[PDB]
Amino acid sequence: EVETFAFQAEIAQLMSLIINTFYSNKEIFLRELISNSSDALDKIRYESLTDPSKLDSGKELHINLIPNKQDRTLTIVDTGIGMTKADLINNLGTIAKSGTKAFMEALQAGADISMIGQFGVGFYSAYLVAEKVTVITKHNDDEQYAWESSAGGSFTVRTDTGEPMGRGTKVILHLKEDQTEYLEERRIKEIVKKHSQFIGYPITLFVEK
Ligand SMILES: Cc1c(CO)cnn1-c1ccccc1
User: Fold this and answer.
1) Cα–Cα distances in Å, from 70 out to 18, 89, 120, 208?
2) Could you tell me which residues carry N6-acetyllysine?
3) What angle, 0 to 180 degrees and rounded to 10, lies between the N-to-C axes of helices 28-49 and 185-195?
4) Which of 31, 156, 169, 177 is most exposed, with minimal Cβ within 10 Å?
5) Ligand 1 pocket: which of 97, 123, 147, 158 to mutate (most atoms <8 Å of CB)?
6) Tally of domains in the chain
7) Alpha helices in the chain (DSSP H)
8) CATH code of residue 173
9) Is 76:39 a contact under the CB 8 Å cutoff?
10) Phi/psi class of residue 179: alpha, beta or left (left: φ > 0; alpha: ψ in -120 to 50)?
11) Quick one: 1 exposed, middle or buried, by C-beta within 10 A (0-12, 13-18, 19+)?
């Protein structure tokens, strides 16, 4: 059972704007995704100060950067609060319509793509370097779901059958054929130290063969 949904008209034109606009400062995607992971970890930590039973699905709060050359994927793993099914379909799409409309008005006013985080839609910066994005997430109050989109105005959602996460969000970036630089160890270490040095959670960058 794989359900296919259509993006909102405002989210669709933002995606095509990110896909089609010539813009060479593409590395800002990792800051936006790590900043998105840091917010999810803050929310589960806050909910735990008044309820220590919410870490039952995992006490550790960290962020993992796992590059893969054989599959040509960069994965950002966090043990944050996760996202529910209503989040993946209705909720965040409604929150993002205002920041989207504000982001375009800023772009015609002189702003550039790197300012996408101050409008709450920084996740779509992943499509600067990805031709397809997979999101595996697990919320304490919901099952494990798989989100996927390759632009075009549509996305899919299904119940994931893979490895149980316990709690968190896994963002898999299927890198474009000409964007394999973000699979290199020394490159990722440079973007992290430059853009996300003050993230208050341990960031472990994995290495491969
Ligand atoms: C996290 C997020 C926002 C807020 O920036 C807007 N859309 N999304 C999102 C991401 C992945 C899948 C479905 C929706």
Assistant:
1) 26, 31, 33, 10
2) 43, 69
3) 60
4) 177
5) 123
6) 1
7) 9-20, 28-49, 85-86, 92-108, 185-195
8) 3.30.565.10
9) no
10) alpha
11) exposed
Instruction: Count Cβ atoms within 10 A of the Cβ of residue 7 and give its class: 0-12 exposed, 13-18 middle, 19 or more buried.
Output: middle
Q: Which of 88, 92, 98, 173 to mutate to test the pocket of ligand 1 (most atoms within 8 A of CB)?
A: 92
Enclosing domain of residue 178: 3-205
Place of tokens 């529910």: 84
- For the CA atoms of 101, 117, 180, 7, what is the dihedral angle to 10 degrees? -30
| Method for structure elucidation | X-ray
CB 103 within 8 A of CB 116: yes
Write a three-state SS string for 171-203. Answer: EEEEECCCCHHHHCHHHHHHHHHHHCCCCCCCE
Angle at 83 between CA 69 and CA 208, to 5 degrees: 15
The values of phi and psi at residue 142, to 5°, are -155, 175
Nearest CA owner, ligand 1 atom 6: 92
Residue 180 corresponds to which tokens in the numbers above?
A: 């394999």
Residue type, 207: V
- Resolution for this experimental structure (Å): 2.5
**Other beta carbons within 10 Å of 12:** 16
Q: Strands 63-68, 203-205: parallel, antiparallel or unpaired by DSSP?
A: parallel
